[PDB]
Design a binder for this molecule. Structure first.
Ligand SMILES: [Ca+2]
Ligand SMILES: [Ca+2]
Ligand SMILES: [Cl-]
Ligand SMILES: [Cl-]
Ligand SMILES: [Cl-]
Ligand SMILES: [Cl-]
Ligand SMILES: [Cl-]
Ligand SMILES: [Cl-]
Ligand SMILES: [Cl-]
Ligand SMILES: [Cl-]
Ligand SMILES: [Cl-]
Ligand SMILES: [Cl-]
Ligand SMILES: [Cl-]
Ligand SMILES: [Cl-]
Lengths: 32, 32, 32, 32, 32, 32
């Protein structure tokens, strides 16, 4: 899948699919 | 990025980049 | 705080504040 | 529910109900 | 270290040191 | 079990058994 680690909400075509980190803080894994 | 939720270790060209789930069980997020 | 374990995105006045579970599956913790 | 991000164990009226963060470190989410 | 995935609070000589799973459900990792 | 918070892959003797933290970053919990 195509995934991004997001500070904001996932894109419309993406789904919250797990957890990643941004500077040691839990972030959204958004995949499609 | 291109990522996969994995039952085994990440491929040689992938890196463990977060946490996902397979059937409600914690799994490796592997991204190339 | 007042928080909920959500299947969908956090409400307008809520913020994604952590990780909880619904039936053993990762879910958004949303707090107002 | 009523939840707090705790450094110590949950109160007797509270139950550990998820994971939150305190300065990028994992902490107990205690809810009642 | 010597650690256990626990359904209850960590023992008095143990410390909550991470997150594990019991039957796909989040649980305290308690380490001596 | 015998567990360690790992930056690299788990030893072949060990199994990835959950999540811990190394300086506020998610690390492999490797147990045996
Ligand atoms: Ca789970
Ligand atoms: Ca962290
Ligand atoms: Cl983003
Ligand atoms: Cl979603
Ligand atoms: Cl998150
Ligand atoms: Cl796999
Ligand atoms: Cl998690
Ligand atoms: Cl909801
Ligand atoms: Cl506290
Ligand atoms: Cl925790
Ligand atoms: Cl226990
Ligand atoms: Cl926990
Ligand atoms: Cl054992
Ligand atoms: Cl290591």
């Amino acid at each position: 899948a195509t995934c991004y680690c997001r500070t904001g909400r996932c894109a419309t075509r993406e789904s919250l699919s797990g957890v990643c980190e941004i500077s040691g803080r839990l972030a959204r894994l958004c995949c499609r």
